[PDB]
Design a protein around this ligand. Structure first.
Ligand SMILES: *[C@@H]1O[C@H](CO)[C@@H](O[C@@H]2O[C@H](CO)[C@@H](O)[C@H](O)[C@H]2NC(C)=O)[C@H](O)[C@H]1NC(C)=O
Ligand SMILES: *[C@@H]1O[C@H](CO)[C@@H](O[C@@H]2O[C@H](CO)[C@@H](O)[C@H](O)[C@H]2NC(C)=O)[C@H](O)[C@H]1NC(C)=O
Ligand SMILES: *[C@@H]1O[C@H](CO)[C@@H](O[C@@H]2O[C@H](CO)[C@@H](O)[C@H](O)[C@H]2NC(C)=O)[C@H](O)[C@H]1NC(C)=O
Ligand SMILES: *[C@@H]1O[C@H](CO)[C@@H](O[C@@H]2O[C@H](CO)[C@@H](O)[C@H](O)[C@H]2NC(C)=O)[C@H](O)[C@H]1NC(C)=O
Ligand SMILES: CC(=O)N[C@@H]1[C@@H](O)[C@H](O)[C@@H](CO)O[C@H]1O
Ligand SMILES: *[C@@H]1O[C@H](CO)[C@@H](O)[C@H](O)[C@H]1NC(C)=O
Ligand SMILES: *[C@@H]1O[C@H](CO)[C@@H](O)[C@H](O)[C@H]1NC(C)=O
Ligand SMILES: *[C@@H]1O[C@H](CO)[C@@H](O)[C@H](O)[C@H]1NC(C)=O
Ligand SMILES: *[C@@H]1O[C@H](CO)[C@@H](O)[C@H](O)[C@H]1NC(C)=O
Ligand SMILES: *[C@@H]1O[C@H](CO)[C@@H](O)[C@H](O)[C@H]1NC(C)=O
Lengths: 137, 433, 193, 96
């Protein structure tokens, strides 16, 4: 409005503010920009992990986590060569194979990951079951 | 005491039963909900870690059970029988329930009509996060839920993957019959399968082999009536809609409860931090922390109770899947109101829909009955069925359908004399010579 | 009633539940088991009970020879039940426990109002009369929080008890459908025999 | 390995099984329980409305389920067969 300085949500959280100098509206977003899942084998087995981001595109990953403001150890899980796009979101840290085994670690949306063979974390489409055919007459 | 009612005609009825299976999986974060992006609040929250590990463990235990329910209900058999090329099994039109290779999805037509009935107004695993940077008209509840750490995890099994299970089960029960559930798949023509299913009711084997065309026409008419009735009424699938609305209302209430200051001078924490020094601002912050922890505890408790109720419903659905689809039993009114207990499963958003095929007797005609007959001083009790009079002569026939038959020695058995029984009549017994 | 805790009446009148149970008993006495699957089919009771012995493994001749003896045993068993239902006070303990639990929960919810929750007095009137509300706001906040916590605890316990009653009612409905309306072969599902 | 037991007589036994069906439906009011007839307490309670709508919704959901249970158990058939005039069905005394 003409006299408004800041807007409010339904949770009484300020989402927009008016700049006192060069009057215009600025939006405010949280720094914790999304939900993150960590996919791991046992620590006694290995120490490599995979990271799942919810409902983002794998182009849009190093803008949704602010990769420039993070340590370089986190920066290797923002981009890379083993990126994969699922219906749940973007999975980085595990390569994608074409085979279909049983489910070990259920990632979501039909994907299961396992510590297959050096050994590394792989991602695959889970197998529904053994294919069978019956001859009707 | 001497009149009976024996039906002369029957009918085939298909009834729908909808059962919820699973609900939405919700994950919460103590950070960016209780304190937000505030280091001063996060420093005081470190002493309440055990109050957060319990909530996370409870929610993960709920989510694993929700994923396990769909595994328990649908994947009864581990053999994926491919769908047959033909859809007519002895005059039975199965094209309405099996998928056809002319559409981008792999669901049946009735499954598409069921999926169009439920409106998924709530979101959490299909809405993009980058969409949450809209205008004043885009200030919706889902973006607030995502900004306050409330996330919805997607289910493990895709709906197109559930469709493969339901197509495999329907193909197996259409081709193999009841054999593939107990052991391996045993092929058998559908007509003898349906004759065997009639034999388990009490009706003789000849009735299907005489009236299979009329029975197939009644079956097709019933499926067409179900198809027509599933396109108009919006209250047929109210249970799944109620589950979705309850979950959305709980999440929206949890979001809206952040506006309470819990006795502090303000509800938002930013003016608490910027208006006072931290010596009494920590006293102000502690009340807000306690109130938000209480709200989280209440939400987790209600979600646990709802998950227990959904678990009970899913166990009942799995029992109905095992006992009524993979085979036929004699439990009264377990799956459908009638005699025949054969069923077909269909998928639905967070639920299953069973189509029960039942046999019901319709046309009635009264008769005179007698308990036994005394021919030559000996009682002749009927081996199966009851003794009936036409009005001038006597026959023996089964109770569930009127098929009169001449009284011979093979239809009856002899036991004792005919002076200890009450209401015995006198007639003749045919003996082949 | 003065503290806002009310009990709503049930929808179905007991004298109208009696109509349902009389209808079921009359239907299973006259029609037999047929009126549940489809329409009501009249049949003499001796033939129906002989058919029920036929589903056990006993031949039809035993009833037609010993109908008077089994009728006398049936009448004697009902007379023994009638005599046993007038002396023992622990035969119906489950419903009494349900009623006592509900009454005790309501009485505890009433009696929990005497706790001041750290305020200088339990009742609010002397809180308002004794101080200005600058600090009596802080005093009333604690009482409000405590009473809200008590209401939350009562609602949670009521929800758990309602879930247990729902499970028992589902079992009772299954027994009504399978044992009264028809006859099956599940061992010890309804009665030891 | 060559002996069997076969009963020569029987008996008819009637056993009782009592099962709960429903419980009492309870309604609560946040006003005139938490604050009573006091406008000063009622003014401060307006910030906790969402803490009371949840309780009311939960108790109404309990009450409707309690009403539904008795509907589910007893009314299996929708045809009210009238009571026959006689009570002796082949020597079976049903008058009790
Ligand atoms: C089986 O019944 C359907 C109607 O319920 C018949 O019509 C088909 O309906 C589906 C959608 O319900 C359409 O996709 C088909 O194109 C329809 N077929 C025709 C020929 O119009 C169907 O024909 C029946 N099956 C057979 C073998 O007659
Ligand atoms: C039993 O009932 C069915 C339908 O309830 C009857 O089938 C109908 O018969 C008439 C004339 O015979 C036809 O015009 C209809 O098209 C039939 N309907 C169907 C769905 O097939 C059947 O004739 C009856 N049988 C007896 C012996 O009464
Ligand atoms: C089987 O047992 C019943 C009772 O358990 C016997 O019936 C009794 O028979 C005696 C003499 O025959 C009568 O005095 C009693 O009044 C009967 N009691 C009842 C309740 O009817 C029956 O006789 C026994 N049958 C055999 C073959 O042993
Ligand atoms: C059925 O049994 C009862 C006893 O259980 C017989 O006695 C009747 O008992 C009821 C109450 O239990 C009284 O209201 C009746 O007045 C009693 N009747 C008589 C004649 O005293 C009853 O007689 C039996 N039924 C028949 C038809 O004999
Ligand atoms: C690991 C791998 O080679 N995956 C292949 C993918 O490269 C290809 O684009 C797709 C289309 O056939 O089939 C699969
Ligand atoms: C001073 O304020 C005016 C308006 O209040 C604004 O336009 C201007 O950019 C500000 N800064 C300077 C250096 O003038
Ligand atoms: C992200 O990918 C989806 C398809 O998976 C697409 O519809 C959407 O437009 C993409 N987002 C952006 C910002 O392009
Ligand atoms: C048979 O006769 C009885 C005696 O009147 C009658 O009540 C019954 O309705 C009749 N049955 C039919 C099918 O008409
Ligand atoms: C009844 O059945 C007898 C069988 O002998 C038959 O002769 C008669 O025509 C039938 N119909 C009538 C109305 O009696
Ligand atoms: C059948 O009932 C009638 C009257 O209801 C009676 O006169 C007749 O004796 C009874 N018959 C038998 C065999 O009990």
């Amino acid at each position: 409005q003409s006299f408004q300085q800041f807007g409010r949500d339904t949770s009484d959280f300020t989402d927009s503010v008016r700049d006192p100098q060069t009057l215009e509206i600025l939006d405010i977003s949280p720094c914790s920009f999304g939900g993150v899942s960590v996919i791991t084998p046992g620590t006694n087995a290995s120490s490599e992990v995979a990271v799942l981001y919810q409902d983002v595109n794998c182009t849009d990953v190093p803008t949704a986590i602010r990769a420039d403001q993070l340590t370089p150890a986190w920066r290797v899980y923002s981009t890379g060569l083993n990126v994969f796009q699922t219906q749940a979101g973007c999975l980085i840290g595990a390569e994608h194979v074409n085979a279909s085994y049983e489910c070990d670690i259920p990632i979501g949306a039909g994907i299961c990951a396992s510590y297959h063979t050096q050994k590394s974390i792989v991602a695959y489409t889970m197998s529904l079951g053994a294919e069978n055919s019956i001859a009707y007459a | 005491n001497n009149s009976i009612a024996i039906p002369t005609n029957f009918s085939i009825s298909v009834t729908t039963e909808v059962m919820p299976v699973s609900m939405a999986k919700t994950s919460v974060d103590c950070t960016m909900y209780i304190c937000g992006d505030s280091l001063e609040c996060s420093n005081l929250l470190l002493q309440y870690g055990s109050f957060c590990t319990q909530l996370n463990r409870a929610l993960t235990g709920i989510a694993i059970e929700q994923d396990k329910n769909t595994q328990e209900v649908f994947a009864q058999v581990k053999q994926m029988y491919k769908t047959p090329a033909i859809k007519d099994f002895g005059g039975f039109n199965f094209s309405q329930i099996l998928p056809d290779p002319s559409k981008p999805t792999k669901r049946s037509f009735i499954e598409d009509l069921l999926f169009n009935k439920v409106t998924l107004a709530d979101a959490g695993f299909m809405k993009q996060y980058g969409e949450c940077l809209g205008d004043i008209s885009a200030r919706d509840l889902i973006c607030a839920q995502k900004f306050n750490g409330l996330t919805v995890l997607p289910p493990l099994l895709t709906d197109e993957m559930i469709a493969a299970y339901t197509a495999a089960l329907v193909s197996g029960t259409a081709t193999a019959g009841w054999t593939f559930g107990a052991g391996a798949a045993l092929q058998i023509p559908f007509a003898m399968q349906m004759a065997y299913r009639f034999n388990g009711i009490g009706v003789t084997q000849n009735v299907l082999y005489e009236n299979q065309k009329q029975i197939a026409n009644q079956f097709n008419k019933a499926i067409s009536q179900i198809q027509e009735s599933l396109t108009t009424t919006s209250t047929a699938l109210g249970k799944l809609q109620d589950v979705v609305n309850q979950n959305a209302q709980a999440l929206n209430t949890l979001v809206k409860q952040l506006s309470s200051n819990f006795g502090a001078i303000s509800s938002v924490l930013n003016d608490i931090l910027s208006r006072l020094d931290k010596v009494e601002a920590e006293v102000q912050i502690d009340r807000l922390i306690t109130g938000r922890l209480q709200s989280l505890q209440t939400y987790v408790t209600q979600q646990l109770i709802r998950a227990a109720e959904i678990r009970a419903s899913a166990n009942l659905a799995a029992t109905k899947m095992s006992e009524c689809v993979l085979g036929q039993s004699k439990r009264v009114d377990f799956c459908g109101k009638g005699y025949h207990l054969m069923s077909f499963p269909q998928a639905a958003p967070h639920g299953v829909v069973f189509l029960h095929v039942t046999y019901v007797p319709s046309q009635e005609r009264n008769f005179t009955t007698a308990p036994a007959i005394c021919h030559e001083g000996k009682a002749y009790f009927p081996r199966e069925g009851v003794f009936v009079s036409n009005g001038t002569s006597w026959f023996i026939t089964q109770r569930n359908f009127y098929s009169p038959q001449l009284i011979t020695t093979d239809n009856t058995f002899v036991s004792g004399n005919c002076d200890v029984v009450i209401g015995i009549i006198n007639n003749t017994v045919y003996d082949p010579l």
